[PDB]
Amino acid sequence: MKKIAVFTGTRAEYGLLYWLMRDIQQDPELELQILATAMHYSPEHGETWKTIVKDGFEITESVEMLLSSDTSSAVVKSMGVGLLGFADALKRMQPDVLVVLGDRFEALAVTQAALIMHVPVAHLHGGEITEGAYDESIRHAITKMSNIHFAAAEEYKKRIIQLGEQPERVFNVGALGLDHIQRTTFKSISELSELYDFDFSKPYFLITYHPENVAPLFDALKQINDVNFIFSYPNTNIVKAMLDLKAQLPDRVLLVKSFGIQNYLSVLKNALAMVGNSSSGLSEAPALQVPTVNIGDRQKGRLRCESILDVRLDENEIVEALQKAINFPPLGLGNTSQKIIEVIKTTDFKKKAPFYDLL
Amino acid sequence: MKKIAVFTGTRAEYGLLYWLMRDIQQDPELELQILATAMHYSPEHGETWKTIVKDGFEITESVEMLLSSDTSSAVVKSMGVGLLGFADALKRMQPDVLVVLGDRFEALAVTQAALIMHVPVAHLHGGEITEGAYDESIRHAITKMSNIHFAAAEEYKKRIIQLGEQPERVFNVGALGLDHIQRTTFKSISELSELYDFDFSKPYFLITYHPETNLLEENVAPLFDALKQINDVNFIFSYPNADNGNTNIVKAMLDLKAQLPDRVLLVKSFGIQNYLSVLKNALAMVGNSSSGLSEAPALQVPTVNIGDRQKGRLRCESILDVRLDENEIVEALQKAINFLGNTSQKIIEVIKTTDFKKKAPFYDLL
Ligand SMILES: O=c1ccn([C@@H]2O[C@H](COP(=O)(O)OP(=O)(O)O)[C@@H](O)[C@H]2O)c(=O)[nH]1
Ligand SMILES: O=c1ccn([C@@H]2O[C@H](COP(=O)(O)OP(=O)(O)O)[C@@H](O)[C@H]2O)c(=O)[nH]1
Ligand SMILES: CC(=O)N[C@@H]1[C@@H](O)[C@H](O)[C@@H](CO)O[C@H]1O
Ligand SMILES: [Li+]
Ligand SMILES: [Li+]
């Protein structure tokens, strides 16, 4: 029996890790541990650790860490509280593997804690490029302190190998979140229509825009005749906009508070195009044959493919892309969890492999 | 007037950083800040902050962090205490740059603290390899979180560039500590003997052994037994660092001291002037410290390097690599018996003439 602990610090990355957790839990020779922390214990986002429990999981260790503040000083303090809790949490859990996804500072924290305490780290989504204040640097630091690496694409695996990781320790397995696409039983147009009191049978745009003046977006959709607009929630700067557009056209736009992964993929499935700058637009929309118009550069650095139509944040260049989207796989198909588990079962990665020099 | 804050966690790195610190203090266009922490405030490692102050430097911010419990979980907790202190220290200092040397866990802590608080990091001694310690992965993580890089050799600079750092931010300026060869006057055998009440005129090994932190079950008896098998030489020890697993080494050192009181000198921490004075006259530098492969060859003193803590570093012909094995150590010892300094100024003018306020993009190799 191998103890596989999954680290989770936000609702979104828990969503991405969901099916790997389900598979470990189901697998009889693998014991699932869960270390939940950071924004799962934030009242701003409704204590999303409860969602983990409601989905059938047992939170093995929980570590409140986030300070109620907006300063970066308080982010450093939050990271310190995190390290203090992670020491005792890893001490009690004694995982054989710690699964860490992404590049948030609490994942950096737990990764270095694991390194010091000799818990092997399996890192997901290393080798990626997504410019920010410093999210990139942190991602690569996590890569350097991890023992095995599950990249989502070949460019990413190659960049991980350039970072000095042994090729036998890097695996292109696809994007784990896309397992949802492969395992969801989608709601029909009738079911979605009855559930949200809205006729999804008249085609629509699904639009998730996240805050990076968003005017040349909401002036860019008023022009598009004869389409309904289903929004998810991204904030008052854009929420106020979305609401203004609602009141102007009270019927042919629907704003939904929280879709949920199943309903969300069902509405995204039956859409002409995913509009906006969310990450859904650069992985889930391609896997669901629905074109994407990505706005601005919040998703700058992610790999592209046929379906992606990137346009700057101005009115005209958007209004063109919408119609062009009314005029019609590197991250994989969605069996990533099983590939990850097969590699974990068949590979020794207890120790950090020797640094890999190119040549 | 640019604010250059120098981070210092241990004696070792402080001595390495000395001439850079003194040159910034002396340079009237740069304001020296110092963030001292970790082993500088532990009585078990000498309270070496006193050395910093006595050298004429002002400790702008101090952060005690080291937990006394000798476990890996206590090391993690020490790093967390570090972060909680560095938050306020860096908040007040508002440095224009933070200078971080090396690969220890407190340096990882302060580097991520500075990154999160948008304080550019100048990292010294990146691109090297020390496979036997978790300092290895720490070092590459610190490289990825640093803005400008000062390496000690072209091989190391090249490894920094492979790590995805922009070429114009990686500089080969040499090892800063070796500036002590030209600018620091060495003590003589008589002054060392009066200063430590121990005769340095008799042949002696200088021994420094730290926990090899990737080794699962470190048992250091083969070294000390090996030392006991030698005749007519003295054993002068510095203390192991604060990594988990050091109290075992301290225990073995105290056992050896009680066994051979007239032949053993245990010093928690020398001044680096004193330390280089002792190393220069030793029969050999025994142990697994980084001085065995930079300072010790530079002073023409043979090195007996034990284990894998220094595995991967550049070698030369006076480096004797052995396993943690009684016979290999005894024989390397029997052999040992029987038988350019402008780095600081280069770093300073690079920091003066370069803009590294923002992390440069990831450098993909062709
Ligand atoms: O009402 C909603 C809106 C979004 N999502 C999910 O939230 C995830 C993250 O969305 P987004 O791309 O906006 O995150 P970001 O890219 O901004 O980090 C996606 O996988 C969606 O499936 C959801 O479950 N319900
Ligand atoms: O008692 C000592 C021992 C070390 N040093 C300095 O620290 C460096 C490295 O020694 P140490 O074992 O403490 O560090 P590490 O092996 O971890 O690099 C040497 O080159 C010396 O310049 C010192 O000043 N006093
Ligand atoms: C700082 C110090 O005292 N010792 C060494 C230093 O010589 C070396 O270059 C560095 C590698 O990053 O690792 C430190 O442990
Ligand atoms: Li299971
Ligand atoms: Li000065």
Side-chain angles (χ1 to χ4, degrees):
Chain A
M1 193 97 127
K2 290 179 130 203
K3 293 197 280 186
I4 319 290
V6 180
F7 177 85
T8 182
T10 76
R11 158 63 174 138
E13 51 108 281
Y14 161 56
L16 296 189
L17 288 155
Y18 173 83
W19 282 112
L20 175 61
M21 292 161 61
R22 287 284 314 275
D23 283 355
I24 296 167
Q25 177 180 50
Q26 168 205 37
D27 194 323
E29 59 186 345
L30 299 179
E31 180 187 344
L32 178 70
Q33 300 182 314
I34 295 177
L35 171 42
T37 186
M39 278 157 63
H40 286 299
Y41 294 87
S42 177
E44 322 175 23
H45 314 100
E47 292 92 19
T48 52
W49 69 267
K50 297 178 191 173
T51 298
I52 307 181
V53 173
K54 211 170 74 173
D55 293 341
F57 292 114
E58 183 186 281
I59 294 178
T60 310
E61 290 288 340
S62 71
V63 180
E64 302 158 308
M65 50 173 289
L66 295 182
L67 263 69
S68 178
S69 164
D70 293 323
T71 74
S72 56
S73 187
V75 174
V76 179
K77 286 197 176 188
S78 301
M79 195 177 185
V81 179
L83 283 183
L84 286 153
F86 299 157
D88 282 331
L90 293 182
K91 180 199 64 183
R92 283 181 301 273
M93 294 167 83
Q94 301 284 329
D96 298 309
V97 186
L98 185 68
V99 177
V100 174
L101 183 149
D103 62 337
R104 297 186 35 97
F105 69 101
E106 73 264 13
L108 180 58
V110 78
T111 297
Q112 77 201 230
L115 178 78
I116 297 292
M117 304 173 62
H118 291 286
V119 177
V121 174
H123 189 210
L124 277 64
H125 286 282
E128 297 180 10
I129 315 274
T130 33
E131 99 275 333
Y134 44 63
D135 310 297
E136 189 142 25
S137 289
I138 292 184
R139 187 182 309 267
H140 305 319
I142 298 177
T143 289
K144 291 319 294 169
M145 286 181 295
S146 296
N147 282 12
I148 195 167
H149 311 265
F150 292 105
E154 277 301 319
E155 291 80 347
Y156 304 149
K157 158 172 184 160
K158 163 262 310 158
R159 189 169 292 110
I160 298 162
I161 293 181
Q162 186 195 312
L163 277 161
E165 302 301 322
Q166 284 290 344
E168 322 100 84
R169 293 295 180 91
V170 194
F171 298 84
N172 183 11
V173 287
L176 173 64
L178 293 179
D179 284 21
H180 287 287
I181 302 308
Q182 182 163 105
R183 304 195 191 186
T184 304
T185 297
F186 299 95
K187 302 288 182 57
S188 61
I189 288 194
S190 326
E191 290 169 321
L192 287 172
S193 283
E194 182 181 316
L195 165 59
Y196 291 118
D197 193 13
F198 212 85
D199 194 48
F200 296 77
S201 71
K202 296 212 301 303
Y204 55 82
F205 281 134
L206 175 60
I207 163 163
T208 291
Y209 182 82
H210 281 304
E212 282 218 81
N213 223 8
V214 304
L217 200 174
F218 292 101
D219 303 282
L221 299 194
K222 300 165 178 281
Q223 304 184 46
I224 309 292
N225 297 153
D226 314 311
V227 185
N228 307 335
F229 313 116
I230 283 82
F231 289 75
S232 72
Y233 268 1
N235 56 33
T236 58
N237 311 123
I238 174 187
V239 171
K240 272 167 180 163
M242 272 162 39
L243 274 165
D244 177 36
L245 283 316
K246 172 61 175 182
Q248 191 178 346
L249 282 54
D251 288 326
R252 81 174 181 126
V253 171
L254 165 61
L255 307 168
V256 181
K257 31 190 181 180
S258 190
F259 264 120
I261 181 64
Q262 171 193 31
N263 296 332
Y264 185 87
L265 302 172
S266 299
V267 309
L268 178 53
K269 190 185 190 297
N270 305 96
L272 306 184
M274 164 66 80
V275 185
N277 63 351
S278 70
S279 43
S280 322
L282 275 82
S283 63
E284 283 142 68
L288 284 180
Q289 83 163 248
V290 43
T292 307
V293 51
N294 178 66
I295 181 66
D297 307 320
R298 180 178 160 102
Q299 303 298 321
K300 170 162 275 295
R302 300 199 177 261
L303 286 185
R304 296 307 191 269
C305 50
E306 306 170 302
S307 149
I308 304 184
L309 280 144
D310 303 272
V311 295
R312 287 183 150 282
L313 193 258
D314 78 335
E315 168 193 45
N316 184 87
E317 305 166 9
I318 291 171
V319 316
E320 299 272 56
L322 311 169
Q323 317 258 21
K324 222 69 176 75
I326 318 175
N327 294 163
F328 191 177
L331 292 197
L333 299 167
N335 194 32
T336 286
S337 163
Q338 284 291 302
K339 300 173 176 183
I340 295 181
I341 284 171
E342 174 67 12
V343 177
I344 290 179
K345 285 188 181 182
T346 53
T347 312
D348 187 353
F349 55 99
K350 291 192 176 178
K351 312 205 313 289
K352 182 74 189 203
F355 190 99
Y356 180 75
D357 286 313
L358 278 190
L359 284 180
Chain B
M1 257 247 214
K2 212 167 296 178
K3 293 202 279 173
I4 324 290
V6 173
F7 173 82
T8 184
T10 90
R11 48 141 193 214
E13 138 235 68
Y14 164 65
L16 295 197
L17 288 162
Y18 176 81
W19 283 113
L20 185 57
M21 292 165 52
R22 179 267 167 210
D23 287 343
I24 301 166
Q25 169 180 64
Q26 200 281 333
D27 194 316
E29 304 212 280
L30 302 169
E31 188 183 326
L32 177 60
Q33 287 168 333
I34 295 170
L35 176 45
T37 194
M39 285 160 57
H40 285 308
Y41 292 89
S42 167
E44 306 302 331
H45 297 91
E47 290 203 56
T48 58
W49 71 270
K50 296 177 165 123
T51 298
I52 297 178
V53 166
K54 160 154 133 54
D55 285 357
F57 293 113
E58 171 184 315
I59 303 174
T60 322
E61 293 292 350
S62 60
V63 177
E64 302 187 271
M65 56 175 274
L66 294 185
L67 264 73
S68 66
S69 181
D70 189 17
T71 66
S72 59
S73 59
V75 169
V76 177
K77 289 204 178 191
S78 307
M79 300 162 72
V81 180
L83 291 180
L84 284 155
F86 301 154
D88 285 319
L90 297 174
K91 175 191 65 182
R92 283 179 299 271
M93 292 166 73
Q94 302 277 303
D96 294 307
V97 60
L98 187 68
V99 174
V100 171
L101 203 172
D103 49 7
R104 297 191 33 87
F105 60 82
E106 70 275 10
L108 180 69
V110 78
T111 303
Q112 58 207 12
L115 175 79
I116 291 172
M117 302 185 57
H118 309 107
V119 181
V121 182
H123 186 212
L124 277 63
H125 279 285
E128 315 182 3
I129 290 175
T130 55
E131 188 180 288
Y134 48 51
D135 298 16
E136 160 81 1
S137 300
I138 289 181
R139 184 185 315 109
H140 311 311
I142 291 179
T143 290
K144 290 321 290 168
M145 292 183 288
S146 296
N147 277 12
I148 186 170
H149 314 265
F150 295 106
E154 187 73 30
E155 302 89 327
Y156 303 146
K157 159 177 184 186
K158 176 173 166 301
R159 190 164 289 106
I160 297 167
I161 288 163
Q162 193 196 301
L163 272 172
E165 298 300 315
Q166 284 290 317
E168 226 295 296
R169 306 230 169 166
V170 194
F171 296 84
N172 176 23
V173 303
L176 174 63
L178 300 177
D179 283 13
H180 283 286
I181 303 302
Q182 288 74 47
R183 306 180 62 174
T184 296
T185 71
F186 293 74
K187 299 290 194 65
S188 74
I189 292 169
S190 313
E191 318 181 70
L192 284 171
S193 297
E194 169 69 18
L195 175 53
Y196 291 103
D197 193 38
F198 194 89
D199 188 27
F200 287 70
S201 174
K202 281 320 189 172
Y204 64 89
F205 294 114
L206 173 55
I207 305 142
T208 305
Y209 188 95
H210 304 289
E212 189 181 319
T213 52
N214 290 340
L215 201 53
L216 263 181
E217 312 226 296
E218 191 170 37
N219 170 227
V220 300
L223 162 59
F224 291 86
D225 297 340
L227 293 171
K228 296 168 193 181
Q229 294 194 58
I230 303 303
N231 298 323
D232 303 316
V233 315
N234 290 332
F235 310 117
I236 301 183
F237 291 78
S238 70
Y239 267 53
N241 60 41
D243 294 352
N244 54 288
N246 73 93
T247 53
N248 272 341
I249 300 157
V250 167
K251 289 176 186 181
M253 292 166 52
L254 296 170
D255 163 85
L256 190 66
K257 173 62 185 188
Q259 236 134 58
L260 312 171
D262 297 327
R263 308 176 55 205
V264 180
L265 170 58
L266 307 175
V267 188
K268 269 181 182 174
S269 191
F270 311 83
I272 192 189
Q273 181 189 24
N274 293 336
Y275 183 77
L276 299 190
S277 303
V278 177
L279 169 55
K280 173 181 180 175
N281 301 110
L283 284 175
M285 175 87 256
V286 190
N288 55 10
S289 76
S290 65
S291 78
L293 280 101
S294 85
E295 270 74 12
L299 292 175
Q300 293 156 288
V301 168
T303 295
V304 187
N305 172 74
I306 308 174
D308 285 2
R309 190 168 179 271
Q310 303 302 324
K311 177 182 165 168
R313 290 203 140 115
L314 284 167
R315 253 54 184 184
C316 37
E317 208 202 328
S318 71
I319 305 301
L320 277 156
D321 290 317
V322 298
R323 297 169 54 243
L324 185 54
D325 172 90
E326 183 174 354
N327 287 283
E328 294 186 38
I329 298 177
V330 169
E331 287 158 27
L333 292 178
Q334 272 302 323
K335 156 61 200 55
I337 293 171
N338 289 164
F339 167 110
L340 252 190
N342 271 25
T343 296
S344 172
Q345 302 304 146
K346 307 186 208 182
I347 292 177
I348 287 192
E349 49 188 45
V350 171
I351 296 182
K352 283 174 167 172
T353 60
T354 315
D355 168 273
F356 51 95
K357 179 177 174 180
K358 180 176 190 217
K359 176 82 181 191
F362 189 93
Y363 171 83
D364 273 316
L365 270 179
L366 120 67

